[PDB]
Amino acid sequence: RKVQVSYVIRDEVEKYNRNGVNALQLDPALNRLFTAGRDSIIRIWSVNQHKQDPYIASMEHHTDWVNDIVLCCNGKTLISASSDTTVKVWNAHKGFCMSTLRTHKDYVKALAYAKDKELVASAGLDRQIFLWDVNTLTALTASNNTVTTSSLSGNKDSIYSLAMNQLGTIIVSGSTEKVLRVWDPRTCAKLMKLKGHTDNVKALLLNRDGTQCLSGSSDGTIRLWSLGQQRCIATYRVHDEGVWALQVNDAFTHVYSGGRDRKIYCTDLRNPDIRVLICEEKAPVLKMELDRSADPPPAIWVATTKSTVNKWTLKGIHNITPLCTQPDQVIKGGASIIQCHILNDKRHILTKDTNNNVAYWDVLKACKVEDLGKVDFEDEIKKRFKMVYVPNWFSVDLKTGMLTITLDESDCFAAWVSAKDAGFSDPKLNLGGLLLQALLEYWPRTHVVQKGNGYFQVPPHTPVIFGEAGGRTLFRLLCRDSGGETESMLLNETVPQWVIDITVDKNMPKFNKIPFYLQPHADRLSASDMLQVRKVMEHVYEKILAEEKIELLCQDQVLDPNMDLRTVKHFIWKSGGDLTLHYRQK
Amino acid sequence: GLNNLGNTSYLNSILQVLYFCPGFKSGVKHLFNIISRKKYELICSLQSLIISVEQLQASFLLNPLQHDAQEVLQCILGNIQETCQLLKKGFELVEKLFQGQLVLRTRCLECESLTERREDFQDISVPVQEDMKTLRWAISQFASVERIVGEDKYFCENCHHYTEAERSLLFDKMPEVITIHLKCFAASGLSKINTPLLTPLKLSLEEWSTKPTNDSYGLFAVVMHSGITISSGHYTASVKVTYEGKWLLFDDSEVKVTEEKDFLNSLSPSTSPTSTPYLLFYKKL
Amino acid sequence: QEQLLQSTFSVHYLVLKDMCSSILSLAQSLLHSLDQSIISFGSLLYKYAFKFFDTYCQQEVVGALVTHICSGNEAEVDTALDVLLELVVLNPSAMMMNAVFVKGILDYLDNISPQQIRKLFYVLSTLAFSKQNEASSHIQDDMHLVIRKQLSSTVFKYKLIGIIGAVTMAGIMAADRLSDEQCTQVTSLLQLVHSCSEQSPQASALYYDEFANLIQHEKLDPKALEWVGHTICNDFQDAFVVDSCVVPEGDFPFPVKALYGLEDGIAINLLPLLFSQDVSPLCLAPYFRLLRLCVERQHNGNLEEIDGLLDCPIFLTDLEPGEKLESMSAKERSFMCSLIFLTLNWFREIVNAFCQETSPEMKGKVLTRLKHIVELQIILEK
Amino acid sequence: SMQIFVKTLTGKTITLEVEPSDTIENVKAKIQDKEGIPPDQQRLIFAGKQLEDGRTLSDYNIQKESTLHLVLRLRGG
Ligand SMILES: Cc1cnc(-c2ccccc2C(C)C)nc1NCc1ccc(-n2ccnn2)cc1
């Protein structure tokens, strides 16, 4: 595929989630909470009430939604699944990624854990389920980096949930097949095919002995299965909308459920008549984590589509009006950029976030210019309108709630801008070439010594990402880390030729031309796109001081002499033919 | 003297079908009268041909490049529509006869939020093979829930992300004539699929309708294509008279009358017919 | 040599299959040569590759042959058509799956000679009617559609091509090895060509020649020969043969008399038809050849039905120049010259018809007709 | 800029990323990249109307989630 260069405009430290939280893990030994965010960052929090700042560390190596995390090996290792089609092994005590598994071909959505055998399974949208041994993964080294893969098979649609029992002898898969498939992880052999759900299944549970299964589906029903009888022994219709999260206690007698309807319930399994409404969240519930320190669980952690993670006490469930009204503990969250507009100069972007704040950003310098507050976004677009046209040279995606700018070979160098039009003091400048040199400034291969493009510098903490167009992430690094030994070898392998030509070979991109034929108002010419009208005025003057005696017009409209033909063709021409300019005496 | 009829069998098949469409010639003569005293050539030429066929049909009863057929029907109905809209500046012959409305529903599999689009349609394009099948299977491949995954993921504006989605089409407003465009052609390279579906005489679209309706449809015209390639061939039309109840086989310059049962057996894919059905027309009962 | 090549493919087609494209590239290049020995070897390299390789390399063989026919070189086209006919005979089943590519040659008939057009229609027709499975029924009706629209084409060049192809196909449908429904299909096709060629005389003359050459050199079904004889004998009698009791009438500027008779009778109506051209008389000879061949096949070499056409008179003027050669006008001399050729061509075809008889009085009539040919040819020089 | 759907020959739906300013020849080139069907062989139907070459998607009011239908020409005569 074609390699793209992308980077994120962000702060050095992002303490709070900038998007929703997909998964939760609780460490009882250190009293630590792990949040798998939709902003591609895993964060560690302290659940102690004494600390007024629960933030501990950020675990930032993914490039897309983190869908599931499991805490294994007594809280020393974290396994994460993500939409970037990778499974990653982490040091949960320190907070750095150790290795990346690239066996999946689509989004990885579910992780299953067997505590006794230390066995972890990863399943995703590619209909593949892979089995991993954590100790084998944790003992991997640079020299010894080979692993034998054992994959389950027989699933005809994309998996959305996965489950294992404590002993690691039963694994259940939920998918859009509307059926549940069960295997034996030891022998990698099929056992049964549970049926009865009429929609996608997103939540799965199993007991310690692995003979009973709890499933919740988008149809709004919770079904209790018996693996010995291979049948559904009970069906619970508790929620108005789909069920997305499930939690059960150690006795496997009470199930905690939540989903799209934003309501969380505690349902008694032996008789569904005892139903307690724990709370009503402000957003659809994506995942829930129980506090298993005491029996019954004192509290439950809830992750929603909002950036805030809340804890709800369970004091009095066994002792409709909700049980709780305000969460006991709150972990703050940031704001997600939801709307984006690129201004006419193709250098500044106005963004609006979930708090309705409007901000002004500089793509070239990869920094925020100013905050505007709760200003009308559409009015601000008109207020900053300019009479200029610059070709598109970058793309913007807001999947992680942050500004990610993508540079592709097709249009990276399509924007030529004179230095006077920009804020740099006129030599002729290519925005795409300047940005690439600033991103790879610390790379020794680009030094011939001068550093960078000599006009601006992106923040050193800017994450630079190399990846295939609609594919995998080849290499990810910070801007300031390009000078390292290990990063330089990786950069040589991953940086494509079209970036090498400009950053290493120091070549200059093409100069595009528009052909225009002058006609007297009542001879084809081609010139640079940034050529001003004044130059065409003086060319006619020699054909027949130049500005004062000659006026140019297009489509029966007078032309600004300081304006360029690139702006003329885009705005005033309003036609599919070659640009036509008419010269008439003033 | 009529050996040149075959050179335009694509247009002849469309005109033969349009002639027996209930109300098509009734509506065309209404427009012809309005254009008559207004003093456009397409309506006038259409009326002359309809009169000419009426003379021929009465005599029959008393004294016994290469072009796509669907594309030609599209141009004829489109040009009739434009003239009707010009007459505004009754006049809803195309809208009432052939134009219906679809509701296209997309459901994201992450947030489970529903988005809908409303689009007009004049025919229903359905596949003939998967990659013995009936017409119900073809419409199911058209209007039942399909999951778009992998390289064809849906971009949810609620999630601001590429997500798997379910797409379903529903029939909101039904026209009097339901045209079925059969994709009896595949790609690897382009070829023609010679195996037809099991075409039923009765069609119920309640399975894919926004509301439960008891309106049924009956087949009255079939446009077939004979040939082993899609680049060239011959078009024939079999219409139904509503002699009533029999099927008229228009083959260039000759007309054949057959019983309804006989024509149905000729449409069976088991017999491997040489004429591959291409357009099915159903009228509301 | 061929046997060495045959043995090579026969016992080692496993190793050769992995490089069929390499073999085909060599075979295609060998066919571009000018030596028959090399050309014949390249044809065999095509035939053996088709026989001993898989389905994919077979389609490459047919596709390579199609490109040879659509190339432009005469020798290359006829050789590739020979291979195509061979491949159809040995493996009709494998060729039935390649009929789409073989049918594509019909779009490039402009750069193909009429002799190669007849051969191209022969391989197409013999492939379509080789089997009776459902696969063959699709190409059988598809070949019918192509010809029905060449016959009805506005271009005269394509109309002549349709006559050649329709007669070629009708010979293979009626080939004796046939049910009544098969017999009426070949009858229906022949009626179509006869109807489509009536308007033009040269197009009609081509139909009579092609259909006569088919009967002479092929053995058809007995039933098919029955219908063609009755319609041809009746139409020809109604077209040219007239009673001698009725004297000619018209505005002819020359005296009209029965001429060149032998020994209540029939006579050939020729002069009024040619003057009316100021069934066409230009097709009198090719049509009678068709009639004669039809009667011979029906009666197994017997010609007792048409014995009266040998000794019948011919309506002609005083073709002897009576010292008026210079006074004859330009229009009259051109009409006079055309009068001699048609009478000569009619006499030549009579000699063709009755040269195989045995009756002593029959032979003298043939000799007299031969003497008339010599006399008329000398008069033509004047 | 916007994403539209195309129902292919088998009835399977694919997705395209298009600009409101793309011409019909650009959409057909994108469909050939995903389906392998030459643009000159492609017929695109939107809302009962065939898209004509040389026009743009904004001419037909083609927006996000708009569904095109892909068919070929079954020529005859
Ligand atoms: C030979 C022929 C071929 N095409 C058409 C025709 C028909 C409709 C529209 C347009 C056309 C032509 C002009 C393209 N008409 C034909 N013949 C006349 C005819 C009509 C009706 C019957 N019929 C039998 C029982 N009820 N009606 C029988 C014969």
Ligand SMILES: [Zn+2]
């Ligand atoms: Zn969504």
